[PDB]
Write a protein that binds this ligand. Sequence first.
Ligand SMILES: Nc1ncnc2c1ncn2[C@@H]1O[C@H](CSCC[C@H](N)C(=O)O)[C@@H](O)[C@H]1O
Ligand SMILES: Nc1ncnc2c1ncn2[C@@H]1O[C@H](CSCC[C@H](N)C(=O)O)[C@@H](O)[C@H]1O
Ligand SMILES: [Zn+2]
Ligand SMILES: [Zn+2]
Ligand SMILES: [Zn+2]
Ligand SMILES: [Zn+2]
Ligand SMILES: [Zn+2]
Ligand SMILES: [Zn+2]
Ligand SMILES: [Zn+2]
Ligand SMILES: [Zn+2]
Ligand SMILES: [Zn+2]
Ligand SMILES: [Zn+2]
Ligand SMILES: [Zn+2]
Ligand SMILES: [Zn+2]
Lengths: 327, 122, 430, 427, 256
Amino acid sequence: QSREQMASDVANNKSSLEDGCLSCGRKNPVSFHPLFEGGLCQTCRDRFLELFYMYDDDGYQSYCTVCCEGRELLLCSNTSCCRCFCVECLEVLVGTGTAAEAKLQEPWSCYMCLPQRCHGVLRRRKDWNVRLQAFFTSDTGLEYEAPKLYPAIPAARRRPIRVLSLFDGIATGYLVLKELGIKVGKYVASEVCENIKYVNDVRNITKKNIEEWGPFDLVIGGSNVNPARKGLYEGTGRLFFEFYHLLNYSRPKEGDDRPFFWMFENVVAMKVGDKRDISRFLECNPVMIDARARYFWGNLPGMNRPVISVPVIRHLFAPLKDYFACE
Amino acid sequence: EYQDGKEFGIGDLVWGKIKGFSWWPAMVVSWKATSKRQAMSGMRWVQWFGDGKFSEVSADKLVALGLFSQHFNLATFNKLVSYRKAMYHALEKARVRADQLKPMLEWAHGGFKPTGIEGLKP
Amino acid sequence: DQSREQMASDVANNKSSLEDGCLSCGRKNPVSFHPLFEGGLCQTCRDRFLELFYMYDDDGYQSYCTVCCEGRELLLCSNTSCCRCFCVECLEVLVGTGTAAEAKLQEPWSCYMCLPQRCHGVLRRRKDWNVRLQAFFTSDTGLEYEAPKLYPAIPAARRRPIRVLSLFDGIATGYLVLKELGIKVGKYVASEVCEESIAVGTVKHEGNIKYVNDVRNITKKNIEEWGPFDLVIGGSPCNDLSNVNPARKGLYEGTGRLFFEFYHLLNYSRPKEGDDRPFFWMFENVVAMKVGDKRDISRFLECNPVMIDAIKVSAAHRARYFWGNLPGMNRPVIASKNDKLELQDCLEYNRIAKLKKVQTIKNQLFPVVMNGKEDVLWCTELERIFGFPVHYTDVSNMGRGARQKLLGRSWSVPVIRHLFAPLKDYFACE
Amino acid sequence: DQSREQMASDVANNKSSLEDGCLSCGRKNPVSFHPLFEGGLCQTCRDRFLELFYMYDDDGYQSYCTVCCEGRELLLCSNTSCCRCFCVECLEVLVGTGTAAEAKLQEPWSCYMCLPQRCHGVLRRRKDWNVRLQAFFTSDTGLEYEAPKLYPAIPAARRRPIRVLSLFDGIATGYLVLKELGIKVGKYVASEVCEESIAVGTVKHEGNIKYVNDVRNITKKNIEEWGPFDLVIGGSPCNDLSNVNPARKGLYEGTGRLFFEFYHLLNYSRPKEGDDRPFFWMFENVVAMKVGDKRDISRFLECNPVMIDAIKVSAAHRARYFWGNLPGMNRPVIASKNDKLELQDCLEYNRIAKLKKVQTILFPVVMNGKEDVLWCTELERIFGFPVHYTDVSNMGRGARQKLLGRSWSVPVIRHLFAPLKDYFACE
Amino acid sequence: DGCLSCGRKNPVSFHPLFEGGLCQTCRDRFLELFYYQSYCTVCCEGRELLLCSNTSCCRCFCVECLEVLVGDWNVRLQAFFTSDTGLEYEAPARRRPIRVLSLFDGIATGYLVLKELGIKVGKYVASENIKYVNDVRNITKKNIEEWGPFDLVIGGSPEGTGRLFFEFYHLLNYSRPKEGDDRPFFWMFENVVAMKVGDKRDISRFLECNPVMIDAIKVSAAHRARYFWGNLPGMNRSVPVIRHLFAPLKDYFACE
Ligand SMILES: Nc1ncnc2c1ncn2[C@@H]1O[C@H](CSCC[C@H](N)C(=O)O)[C@@H](O)[C@H]1O
Ligand SMILES: Nc1ncnc2c1ncn2[C@@H]1O[C@H](CSCC[C@H](N)C(=O)O)[C@@H](O)[C@H]1O
Ligand SMILES: [Zn+2]
Ligand SMILES: [Zn+2]
Ligand SMILES: [Zn+2]
Ligand SMILES: [Zn+2]
Ligand SMILES: [Zn+2]
Ligand SMILES: [Zn+2]
Ligand SMILES: [Zn+2]
Ligand SMILES: [Zn+2]
Ligand SMILES: [Zn+2]
Ligand SMILES: [Zn+2]
Ligand SMILES: [Zn+2]
Ligand SMILES: [Zn+2]
């Protein structure tokens, strides 16, 4: 069916807006549009999971906020709201190009700023800040078990922590552990090339080195004009698999019940096939945290609790105080 | 290069918009002239006037200087010497394309009559 | 950083040895030796010789120069059974100026590996090039790992049938080879998504193979449901790993990521600590790939590969890398008495083979003459070339293209048999 | 020249018998009998029944009406292994008015050849149709000729290997049958111009067949150079004699002229007068052809044909006409112990056959719960050939199926050639 | 080595009309449709027809052939239309009267020409003193044996040419004298030149004798051209044609 057919039906008020693809007009939707009132088709929802969170170097939205396909973008003059809208969306979902005709005459505020009003067959849904959150980090074709919770330890038998790291920032995980007053005293750093025991070229670390330098108690990792748009065209395969290999090396053997925590970090703007691969290999599901949206895999205690990027890492690492000795 | 099906090729003059800034004139250049560039797919390489820096923004959100009156800033020009200097350079470049900025400013505000905007082509 | 002319002058004037400079760029401080001629090789020329030596054209000829592996124009050798081609500039600076034009009009021109060896200036052909070409490709790597530990022998009374897990099964070469050796099979699980390979493996072996779904849907619990396993084998797709693809994504991307599925599922099925039952595995890939990818695969699997060419047991060139811990993997290859070692033994009635050993799958239409006319190879002759039973792929209405495609990416029976042979001393036979 | 309704009323009123009129047009003066039902057939309706009773549709269903072979709308039978279709006007005038609409809503409808026999008015199915149907085609011809002259027996010490000439050889079924029978072949000259069939006969029989050129370039001197011959066989192409061709030129025209090459070269190799050596021949053609040509072929060949259906010894329908003078041509056909008589005996591993006998050559096979078609190695078993027989010269499903589709049938020829072992050497 | 009627390259033949090459398909249709056809003589184009019936000037140039060409006639034309592509190398008192079997009775053309020769005719057996019985379809070996022996067989024609040719072949094969005999036996066929090449090749192959050409342009004033077959003496050298062919047969027949 054509996009005008759905608008005609809505103007007749003879159907619901969740019967076709709001971005393409194709029927048989698979999910719901998290912002407006409409359905999402199968091929039109995969593109929404990648490009919806992409900002260019200008600080403005890269693609359309409705169809995520940009050919001629009109801008939101209001600051702290960098949304941009398409050129045919404003003529099909509003009714005509009258808004476009009046768009360039004066500075314009987008549809996410002005008080809610049904500007035709396009209705800003009342609540979006929650179902948008539930749209991304849920509704996936995998289901795993909750991680095993280690029992807490009394402070009379607490020892300093031992950290192996592979973050982008060499010392990013060192300062955070110092602001919390946790007993540092073992720290090995590295990087993916092309008390801190810095060693470059992670290609040089062997199993025997992990055996001698260990045992470890926390393994972390995950890390130029357009750092946000070059990510899709480059790929993140190299960064994940060396972290996975070293996590396999350092993981406690069978019959050992000592605590062991890990965490992986990645940005949201990535292809739909990589998230499934990481979830399958790591045997868990991510939780998004908004400060720059980011995914987080791991087994740290209380990882999906509500918020009460140094602050984000501090929030994530806070519940570690009751396992390892402080000060 | 830049034959990706989009408009606004090499040598064109367009406007721009930067967070924390205002509309600024820019010059489309090639990646070879840039100190470090690779001709990113789907975007364009521009160079600001009065600063000399190289910027690479997408082509979709680009607007030419045809509507000069629709992208003017009197307060910014009055309160910033750099804005007036950039306006003077833009006016001089447009005139050569074929506080003394008042005559060419009135020339631009009138719509480039009778020559129009056809003389801005490379 | 001198030139080739200076090095040639120095060696000709009896003032230097050939083993101090690089034959391909005339540099110094070489790290290895040229396997074919006398001399040395610098660091950046091994990584060009290692990847590009075995690449071949669609016309059954070598693609690059035999000396430098980088040619602007090539002089093809005219004699058959030798498909080498030499470089334009590699001659006049090494054998003598003005020789390219003289040899160009010569007919039939013979390269320097065919005719009886003569010291044409600085082109001194080696006496034992065959012995050293194996050592160039098998040894002198980056890192070295500890040898695998042997398992204690088992007496003939306490042997059990073998249980096998096979990833990227194909047309089930492992089952066929294990049955031809007389080993008693207890179970055989196969993972495959092609609908014609499943047909071949179900029709030909009477449904003794338990088929499963795509490899990306196998979970932790499935391994324990189906196991325990005694042999895990697999060969990953090399579509995005070879140099023949100008748009190769390499490892970590595309279809080259499927090595990590084998790596992931091999760790699940491995025996736990404190267990001592025998466990064997094997992985296979091509030789025409980047040195970084090979050095990474060796790093993850913790072993160096062995290079085996099928030319020593059959009638085709097919060189592959093998990782594994099977016993006696690097013992010398010796042919058998029932191996069809030439193209004539693999032809039908009233057909004459002009060649003796064909290239892998008047160049592609010139292997066979029949009734005074040039012909091509039949499917039943490719089946004999690879070592399969005749009429093995006559299943499910597929024609010449599908059968040739299925045979072209398979393993080689006389090589897998050579590798699996020493397994009979560990599992029940007959 | 009355119509059908008056005849039906007369027979219903118990004043006439069905054997006095033609069930297809209601006329009088019958000349034969309806093979299936009770009644008689007029002169002009037999010439339409004979040409069309065996024609079949691409959908595995009978092409024309079963009773009159002339219909406007067809009512296909629903029972499997029954492809019969009836005639709309044939129902209401014979069984009773008001049945065409009633039966159209019947599910699953079964024809009168399926349900137990009953006199549905005047439609009385015969109780021995399988016997008189055979005699309808074999006997009751136009003219009659004399009996063949049997040759005296030969003692087992004075027998020699056989010499064979074959025309339009195909994929050499005669050589395969003769070698399977145990007879000893001293020569086999085959004429064929297809490049893929020559490859099959060369590779499979190790070059014992001597191939020659087109049949139109063989002269009088060649026959006496290659002769003498003791058996001369052949079968002409049927691309211009069957009724499946809307633009068929028939005999005397087109590619149907190739029959007269067989008749011409049969005279050259025939023994001269005053000679007493055994000599045999056999010509073969399809049954679904014009009646006018059938009496013409018999006139030239001087003998009447026999009709053998491959359904009694195989798993397919294929009816053919055989001319010749072989000893014991018309003896009853009996199956052997090694004949795969049902479709399930000709299938690969893990396949289930929905049918049991296939029509003339997505339905037949269901594999893993999904419908499928027959493979190339399954059509070889149905016709009797050894498996992997046509796996030669890179051809696929398109070309292998064409070679098998126009060939002979091994059990039929083995039935015909069996009594040839009493005149020629064996082992 | 270039074609003239068609102009196609790789030519190995020549146009029979005059100088100019003939392609593979040009010569095939050159002798097939030679003979009022609205086809050109040189270009062999049947697209546009021009009318010209002047005395000794009937070659009307084709309209499309005006730019194609403009922009041994009595020696080579005869040879090309009688050349033997297949060489069948075989040239062959007080006696009894003549008895003849015939086909295509028509108006009994044989009876009067046999009677006018001065030799009495014994028995005439038509199949279409005249003894007409029935059609060819009702003749058996017993009928031939009852009415035989015979002396000569005549048949021919002035939807095809095979339906009667093969019947004549069958009847002649029946009527042929047995092997090892010296009794005289003659025969001849008759058909018009306007025929397909396959028909001519098949007829020449079955009778084992190459045809000869007889044209009425030298004995009459109408375009009657006929191919002939037979073993009568005199072809190697319209009722007058049959009169000429029947004149010499008095040598081997009754002369006391
Ligand atoms: N995702 C996947 N899961 C299971 N098998 C796959 C797969 N992707 C590709 N394959 C199979 O892996 C095979 C690699 S070719 C190797 C074939 C095999 N080594 C042999 O002995 O013949 C291909 O035939 C393909 O069918
Ligand atoms: N002009 C010709 N000369 C010789 N053979 C011919 C021919 N025209 C057709 N044929 C062959 O005659 C065959 C008739 S189909 C009959 C096949 C054969 N009787 C069998 O037992 O299988 C065809 O395969 C065709 O190849
Ligand atoms: Zn859509
Ligand atoms: Zn849009
Ligand atoms: Zn806004
Ligand atoms: Zn070098
Ligand atoms: Zn070179
Ligand atoms: Zn050589
Ligand atoms: Zn009738
Ligand atoms: Zn009917
Ligand atoms: Zn029925
Ligand atoms: Zn010509
Ligand atoms: Zn002309
Ligand atoms: Zn003239």
